[PDB]
Structures are given as structure tokens and as C-alpha cells.
Coordinates of C-alpha atoms and ligand atoms in Angstrom, one line a residue:
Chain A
X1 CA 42.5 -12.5 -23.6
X2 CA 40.8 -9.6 -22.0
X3 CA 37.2 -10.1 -22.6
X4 CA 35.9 -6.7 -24.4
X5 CA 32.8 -4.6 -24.2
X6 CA 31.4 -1.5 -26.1
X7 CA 29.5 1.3 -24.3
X8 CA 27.1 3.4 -26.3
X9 CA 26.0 6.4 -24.8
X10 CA 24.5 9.8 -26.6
X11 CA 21.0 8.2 -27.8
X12 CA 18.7 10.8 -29.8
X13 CA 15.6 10.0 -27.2
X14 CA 15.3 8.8 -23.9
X15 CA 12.1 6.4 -22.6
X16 CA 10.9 6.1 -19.6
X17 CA 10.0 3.1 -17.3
X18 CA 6.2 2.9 -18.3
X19 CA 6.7 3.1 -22.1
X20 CA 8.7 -0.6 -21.8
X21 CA 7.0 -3.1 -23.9
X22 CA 8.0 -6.3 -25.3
X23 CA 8.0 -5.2 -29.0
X24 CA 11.5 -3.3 -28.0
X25 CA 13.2 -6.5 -26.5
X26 CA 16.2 -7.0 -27.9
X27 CA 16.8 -3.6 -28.9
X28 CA 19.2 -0.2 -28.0
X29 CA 17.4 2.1 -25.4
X30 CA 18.2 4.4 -22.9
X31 CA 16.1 4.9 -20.0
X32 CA 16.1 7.3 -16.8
X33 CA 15.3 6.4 -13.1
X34 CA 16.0 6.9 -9.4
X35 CA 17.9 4.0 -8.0
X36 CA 16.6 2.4 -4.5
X37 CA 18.7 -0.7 -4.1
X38 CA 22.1 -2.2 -5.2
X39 CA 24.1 -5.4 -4.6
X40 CA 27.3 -6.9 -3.7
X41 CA 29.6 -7.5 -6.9
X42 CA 29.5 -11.2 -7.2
X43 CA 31.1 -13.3 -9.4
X44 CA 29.5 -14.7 -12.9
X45 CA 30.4 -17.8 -14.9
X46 CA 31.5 -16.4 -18.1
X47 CA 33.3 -19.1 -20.0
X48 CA 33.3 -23.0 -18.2
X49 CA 36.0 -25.1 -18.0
X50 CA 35.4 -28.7 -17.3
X51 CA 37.4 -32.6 -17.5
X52 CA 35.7 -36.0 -18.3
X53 CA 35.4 -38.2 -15.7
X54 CA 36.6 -41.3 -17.5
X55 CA 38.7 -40.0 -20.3
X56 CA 40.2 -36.6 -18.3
X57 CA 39.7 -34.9 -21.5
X58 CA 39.5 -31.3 -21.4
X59 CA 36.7 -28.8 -22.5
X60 CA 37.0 -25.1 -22.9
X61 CA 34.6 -22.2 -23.4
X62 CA 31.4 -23.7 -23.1
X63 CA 29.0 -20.7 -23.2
X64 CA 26.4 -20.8 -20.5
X65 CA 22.9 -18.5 -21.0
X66 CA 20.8 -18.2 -18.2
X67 CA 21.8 -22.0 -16.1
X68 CA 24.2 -24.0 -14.9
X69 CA 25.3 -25.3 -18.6
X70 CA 27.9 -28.6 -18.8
X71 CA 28.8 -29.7 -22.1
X72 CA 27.3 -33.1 -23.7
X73 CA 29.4 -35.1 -26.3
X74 CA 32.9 -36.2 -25.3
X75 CA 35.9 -34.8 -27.2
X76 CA 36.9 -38.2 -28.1
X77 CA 33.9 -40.3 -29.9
X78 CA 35.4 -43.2 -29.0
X79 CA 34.1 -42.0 -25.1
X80 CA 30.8 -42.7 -24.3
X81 CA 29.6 -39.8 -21.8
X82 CA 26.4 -37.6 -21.4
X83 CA 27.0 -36.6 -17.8
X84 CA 29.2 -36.5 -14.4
X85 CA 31.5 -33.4 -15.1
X86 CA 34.1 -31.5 -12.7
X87 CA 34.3 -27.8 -13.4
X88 CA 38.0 -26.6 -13.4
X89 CA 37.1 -23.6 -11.3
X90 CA 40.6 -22.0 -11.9
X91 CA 41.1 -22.1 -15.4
X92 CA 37.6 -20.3 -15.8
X93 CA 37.0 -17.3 -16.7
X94 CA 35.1 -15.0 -14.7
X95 CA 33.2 -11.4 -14.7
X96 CA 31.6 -9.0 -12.0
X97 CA 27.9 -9.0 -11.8
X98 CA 26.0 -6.5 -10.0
X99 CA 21.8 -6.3 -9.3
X100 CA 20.2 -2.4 -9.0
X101 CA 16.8 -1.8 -8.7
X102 CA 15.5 1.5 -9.9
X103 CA 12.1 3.3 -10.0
X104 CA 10.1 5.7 -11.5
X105 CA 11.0 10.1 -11.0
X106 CA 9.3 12.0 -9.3
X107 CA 7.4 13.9 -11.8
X108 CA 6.8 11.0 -14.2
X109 CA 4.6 9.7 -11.4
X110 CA 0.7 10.5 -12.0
X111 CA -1.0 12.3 -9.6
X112 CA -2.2 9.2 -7.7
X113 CA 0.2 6.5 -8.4
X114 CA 2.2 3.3 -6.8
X115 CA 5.6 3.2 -8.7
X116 CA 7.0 1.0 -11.0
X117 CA 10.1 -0.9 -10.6
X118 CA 12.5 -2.8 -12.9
X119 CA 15.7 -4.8 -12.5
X120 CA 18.6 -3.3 -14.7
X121 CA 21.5 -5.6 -14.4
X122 CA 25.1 -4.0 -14.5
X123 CA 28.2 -6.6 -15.4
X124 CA 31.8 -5.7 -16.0
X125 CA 33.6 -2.3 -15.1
X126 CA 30.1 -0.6 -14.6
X127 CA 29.3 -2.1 -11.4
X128 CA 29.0 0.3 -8.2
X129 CA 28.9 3.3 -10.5
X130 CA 25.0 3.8 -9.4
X131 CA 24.5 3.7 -5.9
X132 CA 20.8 4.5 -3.8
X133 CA 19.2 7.8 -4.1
X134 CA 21.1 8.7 -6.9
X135 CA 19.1 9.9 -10.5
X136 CA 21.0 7.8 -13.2
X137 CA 20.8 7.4 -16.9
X138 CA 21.2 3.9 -18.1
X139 CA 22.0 2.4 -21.7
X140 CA 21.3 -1.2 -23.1
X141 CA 20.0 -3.8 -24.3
X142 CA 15.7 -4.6 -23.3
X143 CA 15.7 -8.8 -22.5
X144 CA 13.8 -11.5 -20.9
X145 CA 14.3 -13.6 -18.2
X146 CA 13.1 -16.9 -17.2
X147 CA 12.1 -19.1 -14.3
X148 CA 15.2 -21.1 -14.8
X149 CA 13.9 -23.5 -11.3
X150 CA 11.5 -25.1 -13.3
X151 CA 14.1 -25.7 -16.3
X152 CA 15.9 -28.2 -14.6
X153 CA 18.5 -27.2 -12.0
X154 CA 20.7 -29.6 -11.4
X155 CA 21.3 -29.7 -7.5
X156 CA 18.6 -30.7 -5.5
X157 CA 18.7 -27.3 -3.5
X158 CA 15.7 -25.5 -5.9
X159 CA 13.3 -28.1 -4.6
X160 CA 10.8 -27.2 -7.3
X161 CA 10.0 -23.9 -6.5
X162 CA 10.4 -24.0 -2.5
X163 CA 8.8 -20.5 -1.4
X164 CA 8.1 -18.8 1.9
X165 CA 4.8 -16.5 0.9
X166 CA 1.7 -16.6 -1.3
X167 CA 1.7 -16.5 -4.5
X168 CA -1.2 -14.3 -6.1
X169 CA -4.4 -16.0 -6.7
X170 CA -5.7 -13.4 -9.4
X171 CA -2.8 -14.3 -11.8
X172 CA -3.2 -17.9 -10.9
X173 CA -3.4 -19.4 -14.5
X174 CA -3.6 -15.8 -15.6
X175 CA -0.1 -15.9 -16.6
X176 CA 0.9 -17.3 -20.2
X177 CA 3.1 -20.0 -19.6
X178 CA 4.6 -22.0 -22.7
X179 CA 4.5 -25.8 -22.6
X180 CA 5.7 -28.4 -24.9
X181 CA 9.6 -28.4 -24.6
X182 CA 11.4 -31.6 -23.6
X183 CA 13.6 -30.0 -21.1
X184 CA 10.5 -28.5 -19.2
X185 CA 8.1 -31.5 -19.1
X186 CA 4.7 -31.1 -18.0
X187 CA 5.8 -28.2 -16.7
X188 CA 5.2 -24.0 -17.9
X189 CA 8.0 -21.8 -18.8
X190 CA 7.4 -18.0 -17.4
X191 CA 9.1 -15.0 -18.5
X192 CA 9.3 -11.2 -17.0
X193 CA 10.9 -7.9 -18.4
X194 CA 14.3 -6.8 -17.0
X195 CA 17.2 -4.2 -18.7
X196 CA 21.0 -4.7 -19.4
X197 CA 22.7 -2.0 -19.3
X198 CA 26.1 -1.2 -20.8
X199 CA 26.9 2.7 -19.7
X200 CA 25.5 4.9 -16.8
X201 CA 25.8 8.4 -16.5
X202 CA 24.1 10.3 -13.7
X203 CA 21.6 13.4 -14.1
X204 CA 20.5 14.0 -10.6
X205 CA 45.1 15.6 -0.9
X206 CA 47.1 18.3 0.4
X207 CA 50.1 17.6 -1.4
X208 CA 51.3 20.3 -4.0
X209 CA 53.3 18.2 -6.6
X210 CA 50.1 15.7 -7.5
X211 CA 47.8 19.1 -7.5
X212 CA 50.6 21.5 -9.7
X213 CA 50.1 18.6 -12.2
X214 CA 46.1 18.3 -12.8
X215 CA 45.8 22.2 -13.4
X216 CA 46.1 23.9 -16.8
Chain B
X1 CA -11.0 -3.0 0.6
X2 CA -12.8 -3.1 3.7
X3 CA -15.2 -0.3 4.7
X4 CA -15.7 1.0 8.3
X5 CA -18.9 1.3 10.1
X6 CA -19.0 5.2 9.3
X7 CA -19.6 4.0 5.4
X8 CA -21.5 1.1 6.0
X9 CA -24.3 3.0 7.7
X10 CA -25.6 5.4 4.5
X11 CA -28.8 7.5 5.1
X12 CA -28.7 5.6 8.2
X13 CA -27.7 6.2 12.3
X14 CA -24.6 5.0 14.1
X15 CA -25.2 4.8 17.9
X16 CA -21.7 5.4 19.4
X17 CA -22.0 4.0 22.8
X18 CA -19.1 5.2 25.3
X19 CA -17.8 8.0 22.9
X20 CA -16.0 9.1 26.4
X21 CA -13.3 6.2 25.9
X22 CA -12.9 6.3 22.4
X23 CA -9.9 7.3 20.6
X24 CA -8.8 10.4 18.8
X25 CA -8.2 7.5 15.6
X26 CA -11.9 7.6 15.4
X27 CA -12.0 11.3 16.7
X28 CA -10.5 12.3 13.3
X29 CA -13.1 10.2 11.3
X30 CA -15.7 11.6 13.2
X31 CA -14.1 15.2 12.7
X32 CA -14.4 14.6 8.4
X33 CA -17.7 13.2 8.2
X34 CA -19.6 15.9 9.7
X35 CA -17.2 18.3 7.6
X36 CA -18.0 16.4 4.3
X37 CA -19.9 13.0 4.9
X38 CA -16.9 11.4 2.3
X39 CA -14.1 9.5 3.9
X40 CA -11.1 9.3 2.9
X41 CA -9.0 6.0 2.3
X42 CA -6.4 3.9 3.6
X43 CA -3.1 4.9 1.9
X44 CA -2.7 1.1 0.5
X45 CA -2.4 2.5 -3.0
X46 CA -6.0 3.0 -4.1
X47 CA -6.7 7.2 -3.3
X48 CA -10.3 6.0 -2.7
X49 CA -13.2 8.4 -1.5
X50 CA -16.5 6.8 -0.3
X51 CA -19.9 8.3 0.6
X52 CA -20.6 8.4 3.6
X53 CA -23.8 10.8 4.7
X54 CA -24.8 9.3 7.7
X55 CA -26.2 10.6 11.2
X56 CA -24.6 10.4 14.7
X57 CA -26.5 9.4 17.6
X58 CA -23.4 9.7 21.0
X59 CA -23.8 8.8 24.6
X60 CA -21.5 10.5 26.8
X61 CA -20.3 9.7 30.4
X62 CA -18.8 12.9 32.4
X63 CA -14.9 13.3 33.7
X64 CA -14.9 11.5 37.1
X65 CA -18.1 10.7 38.4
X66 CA -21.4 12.6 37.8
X67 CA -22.4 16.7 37.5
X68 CA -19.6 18.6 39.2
X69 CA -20.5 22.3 40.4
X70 CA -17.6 23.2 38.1
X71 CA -19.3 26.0 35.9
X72 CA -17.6 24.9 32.4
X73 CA -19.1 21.9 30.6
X74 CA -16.5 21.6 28.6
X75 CA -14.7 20.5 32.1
X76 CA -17.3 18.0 32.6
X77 CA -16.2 16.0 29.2
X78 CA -13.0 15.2 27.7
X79 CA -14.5 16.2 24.4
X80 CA -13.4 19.7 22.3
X81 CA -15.6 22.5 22.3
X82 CA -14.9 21.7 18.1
X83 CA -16.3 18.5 18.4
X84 CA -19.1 19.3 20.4
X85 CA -20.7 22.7 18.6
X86 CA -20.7 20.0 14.9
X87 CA -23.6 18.4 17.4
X88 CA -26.8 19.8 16.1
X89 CA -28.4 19.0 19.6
X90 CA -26.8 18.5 23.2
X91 CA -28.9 16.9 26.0
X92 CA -28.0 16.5 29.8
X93 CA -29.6 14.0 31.8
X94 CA -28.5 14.5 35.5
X95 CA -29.8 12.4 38.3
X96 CA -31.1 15.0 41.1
X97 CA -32.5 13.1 43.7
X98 CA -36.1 13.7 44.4
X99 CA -38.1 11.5 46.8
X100 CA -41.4 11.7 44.8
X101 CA -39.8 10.6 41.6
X102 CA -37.8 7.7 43.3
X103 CA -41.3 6.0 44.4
X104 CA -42.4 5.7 41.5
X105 CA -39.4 4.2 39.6
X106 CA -39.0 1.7 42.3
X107 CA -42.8 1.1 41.3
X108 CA -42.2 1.0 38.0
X109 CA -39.1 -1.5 37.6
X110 CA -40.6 -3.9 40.6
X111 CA -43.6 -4.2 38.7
X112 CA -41.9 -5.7 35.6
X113 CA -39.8 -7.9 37.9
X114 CA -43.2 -9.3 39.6
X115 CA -45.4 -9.9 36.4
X116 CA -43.2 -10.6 33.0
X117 CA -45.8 -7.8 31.3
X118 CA -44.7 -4.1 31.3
X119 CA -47.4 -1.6 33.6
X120 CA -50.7 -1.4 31.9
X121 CA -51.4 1.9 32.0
X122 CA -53.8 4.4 29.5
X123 CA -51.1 4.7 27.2
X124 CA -51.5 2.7 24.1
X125 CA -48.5 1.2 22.8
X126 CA -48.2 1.6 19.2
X127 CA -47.6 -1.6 17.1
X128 CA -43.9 -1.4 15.7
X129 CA -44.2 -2.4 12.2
X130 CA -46.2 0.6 12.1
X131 CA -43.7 2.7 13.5
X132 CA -41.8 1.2 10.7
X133 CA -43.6 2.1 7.8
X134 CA -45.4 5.4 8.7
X135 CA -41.2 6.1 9.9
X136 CA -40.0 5.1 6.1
X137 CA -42.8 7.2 4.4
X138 CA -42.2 10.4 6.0
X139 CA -38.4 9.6 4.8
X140 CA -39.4 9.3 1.4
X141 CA -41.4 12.7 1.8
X142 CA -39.7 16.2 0.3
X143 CA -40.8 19.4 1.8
X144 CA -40.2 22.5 0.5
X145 CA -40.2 26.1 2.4
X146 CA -41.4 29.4 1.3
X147 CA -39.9 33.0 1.5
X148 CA -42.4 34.0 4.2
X149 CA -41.1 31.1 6.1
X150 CA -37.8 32.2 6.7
X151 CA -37.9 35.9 7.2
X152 CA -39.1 35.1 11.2
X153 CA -36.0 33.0 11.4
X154 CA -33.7 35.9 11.0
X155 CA -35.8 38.0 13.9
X156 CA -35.7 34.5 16.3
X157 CA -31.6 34.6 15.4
X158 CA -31.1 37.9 15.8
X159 CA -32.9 37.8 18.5
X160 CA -30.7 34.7 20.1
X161 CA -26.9 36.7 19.2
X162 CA -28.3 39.9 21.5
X163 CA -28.8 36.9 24.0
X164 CA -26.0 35.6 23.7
X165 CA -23.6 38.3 23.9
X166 CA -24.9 39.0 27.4
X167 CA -25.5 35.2 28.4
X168 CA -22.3 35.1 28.8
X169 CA -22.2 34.2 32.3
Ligands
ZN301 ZN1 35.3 -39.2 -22.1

């Protein structure tokens, strides 16, 4: 089944990056920037496929949020099994995932300013259609991300947070982090502000058969 | 933020020692503060002025040697002719050799080299904590001038231009 998406585009208002707070998240905006960096179009896990060890029982579209997500109760009952998976990496589906980071205009900056920056995240057909330099219009959805290291990756390759610079002292503690859940531990959940957008528009052959046809 | 030694020294004096040798990074700060006495700050994101009214004490060693019957001063020094009329007072200090004045410096720096004590001579050497405080006391002291005052200064200018349009030389 081809995996749909809606575009909206045509919003009465447009916002800008310093008017983002987090009583909008979850909501429809549209907001306006200069983009300064884009990635490669890698592949996202959409919709996991894996097989029981034991049984070689079969499990389909198990929806995966922010983490490596494997399923948890056997088909059969009669299996015992919370663990030890094999992802059937073929029968999988896939989507295209693509990074941009974007910054404020040049007039919306103050006087004396350092800009701000925000990660909109483009994911399906809409990937490549902003590239550096460029003045785009996005639309989407406002969401928050977390710190998905300290929420239990499986491989061993996270470390717990390995990292090669300082972190800043001043928000050392600073920084709300939530504590309780079972899947955390001891440990503080963090969250930060990033977009989703679902449409971009931008504001800022010698052969006579193919040509004949285009024209009016 | 870290402040220079420009800032640091407010109503205050910074001896710049070897000003010759020293580069045209510090030239420029040196340029602003006797413009406007407020620097300017790094461009780290901050668009920071600071105070700095301050007063400039420089020692200068000439191009290549000493005095050089070269007419210019400006072809003694490296420095601009810019630079150099901000100075409210320029002093030369060339050694002319003199044979009375060389016996007694000779007599002067042996002496302190065979007794510890400096020459004791008629001269009375002022105590320095007084220097200190009758120094801070005339600092704390406004004057004030008068109209009568003045109106001689514009004859003693004048007088300097019609100089100075024929001294020229
Ligand atoms: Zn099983």
C-alpha cells in the first residue's frame, strides 16, 4: 500500500522563528526562514517487521516513535518471549528522511542580535526541495524531541551519553528534567523544540517536438 | 568578558613602554580612545561599549639608531603624523655629548654603586605618602575659569598661527 500524506499550504498568518513557544506544540503553523544546512536523504524505519527466535512467528507493522522499538508478547501465548528479535529488513517498510537547519531573515533580526536556529525535519517526497541560501516557507506540525540515549538504547554504541565537548555549566541543573518513569531509572528525561514540516514553498533542451508541446 | 588594559586603567595612566614595536592591533585602540575614551567590543555577540577615559604616558625609541640629521621627525619614528598631533605634549631627549655633563653623571651613578645611599645633597627629598595624598587632593579639586581668562588665549593663538605659517621651515 503506498503510504499517504496530506500537504496543507495557504495558512491565514505566518509566524516567525522567535514567536515559537510550547503552548503551540502539536499544532498547524507555518513559518518563514533562510536555510543554512541540509542533509543526505537517509532511510527511516517506518513500519518493522520482525520473527521470534524460538517460535519463527511473524510480526508486522509495529509502529516505532522516536527508538529502536521491537515488539513484546509473542503471537502465540503458548510462547514465552520478551526479547531476542531479528528485524526482517526486506519486508520493511521504509521512508526518506531529510535534516535542514534554518535561521532567522534578515530584517526580523534586532539591531544587535545572534540568530536563532531551529531543526525543521522534512520526510517523504519533500526532501531536497530546500537547499542552502534559499528563503523558504515551511508548513507543519510544532513537536518535541527527546534525549532518546538516556531512554535505553539497546546497543552498547550510545555509551551513556559519550561526548567530545563541554557541556554548559550555567544550565547544569538548570534544565527541567522529568524523573520517575521505569524505563528511565534514576535517570532525567530532556526535551527541546524542533518543526515537521509537510509542504515548502520558496519566497526568496533544444529539441522542437518536447517544446511545441508545453506552449499554449 | 575580559577587559584590556586600556579599560582597566579609568581616571588612571597607562605607561606604554616600547610603543616603537607595537602593533597597529593596538594602534587602532589607541586611535579610538583618544577620539572617544569608549571602546568598542569584541564581536562575540555582546555589542558592548565600555568607559574607558584614561591618560597615555608613551616612550619612544627612533628608526635605526639615535637623532639623524634628517630634517623630518616624522622620519625619525615609525609613528603617523595622525597619531602623533592626538599627543597633547611631545618631548625629545637626545644625548649630545658634552664633557662637563659626562663628569658629573659618572659622579653621580659611581656614588650610588660605592655607598648603597643616593648623593646627599641640599635637596630635600619629599616623603612619598605625601606625594600621595597632597597628589589625590588636588584630583579631587574643580577649578573653574573666568571670561577675562580666556580672551589672552585667543591673542597667544593667534599669535602662534602667524608663527606658524612662516615656521614652516
Ligand atoms: Zn515465540
Amino acid at each position: 500500500e503506498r503510504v499517504f500524506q496530506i500537504s496543507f499550504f495557504n495558512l491565514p498568518t505566518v509566524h516567525r522563528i522567535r514567536d515559537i513557544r510550547s503552548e503551540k506544540i502539536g499544532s498547524l503553523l507555518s513559518i518563514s526562514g533562510t536555510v543554512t544546512r541540509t542533509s543526505e536523504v537517509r532511510p527511516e524505519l517506518y513500519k518493522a517487521s520482525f520473527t521470534c527466535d524460538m517460535c519463527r512467528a511473524i510480526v508486522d507493522n509495529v509502529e516505532q516513535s522516536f527508538k529502536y522499538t521491537e515488539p513484546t508478547f509473542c503471537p502465540n501465548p503458548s510462547c514465552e518471549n520478551r526479547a531476542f528479535w531479528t528485524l526482517n529488513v526486506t519486508r520493511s517498510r521504509f521512508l526518506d528522511w531529510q535534516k535542514v537547519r534554518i535561521q532567522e531573515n534578515a530584517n526580523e533580526i534586532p539591531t544587535g542580535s545572534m540568530p536563532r536556529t531551529l531543526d525543521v525535519i522534512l520526510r517523504g517526497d519533500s526532501v531536497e526541495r530546500a537547499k542552502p541560501g534559499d528563503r523558504c516557507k515551511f508548513t507543519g506540525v510544532e513537536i518535541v524531541v527527546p534525549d532518546v540515549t538516556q531512554l535505553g538504547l539497546p546497543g552498547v554504541k550510545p555509551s551513556s551519553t559519550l561526548d567530545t565537548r563541554g557541556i554548559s555549566k550555567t544550565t547544569e541543573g538548570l534544565n527541567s528534567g522529568v524523573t520517575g518513569l521505569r524505563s528511565l531509572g534514576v535517570r532525567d528525561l530532556t526535551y527541546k523544540i524542533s518543526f515537521l514540516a509537510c509542504h515548502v514553498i520558496s519566497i526568496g533542451e533544444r529539441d522542437q517536438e518536447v517544446f511545441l508541446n508545453s506552449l499554449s | 568578558l575580559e577587559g584590556g588594559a586600556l579599560v582597566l586603567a579609568d581616571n588612571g595612566i597607562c605607561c606604554i613602554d616600547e610603543f616603537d614595536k607595537m602593533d597597529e592591533s593596538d594602534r587602532t585602540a589607541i586611535h579610538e580612545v583618544m577620539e572617544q575614551q569608549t571602546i568598542s567590543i569584541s564581536k562575540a555577540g555582546i555589542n558592548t561599549t565600555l568607559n574607558a577615559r584614561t591618560s597615555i604616558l608613551a616612550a619612544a625609541n627612533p628608526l635605526y639608531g639615535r637623532y639623524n640629521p634628517r630634517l623630518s621627525p616624522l622620519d625619525n619614528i615609525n609613528l603617523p603624523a595622525a597619531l602623533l598631533s592626538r599627543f597633547d605634549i611631545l618631548f625629545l631627549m637626545l644625548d649630545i655629548p658634552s664633557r662637563d655633563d659626562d663628569e658629573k653623571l659618572a659622579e653621580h651613578v659611581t656614588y650610588v654603586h660605592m655607598h648603597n645611599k643616593q648623593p646627599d645633597l641640599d635637596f630635600t627629598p619629599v616623603e612619598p605618602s605625601k606625594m600621595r595624598e597632597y597628589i589625590a587632593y588636588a584630583k579631587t579639586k574643580r577649578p573653574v575659569m573666568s571670561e577675562a581668562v580666556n580672551d589672552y588665549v585667543v591673542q597667544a593663538y593667534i599669535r602662534l598661527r602667524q608663527d606658524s605659517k612662516r615656521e614652516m621651515d
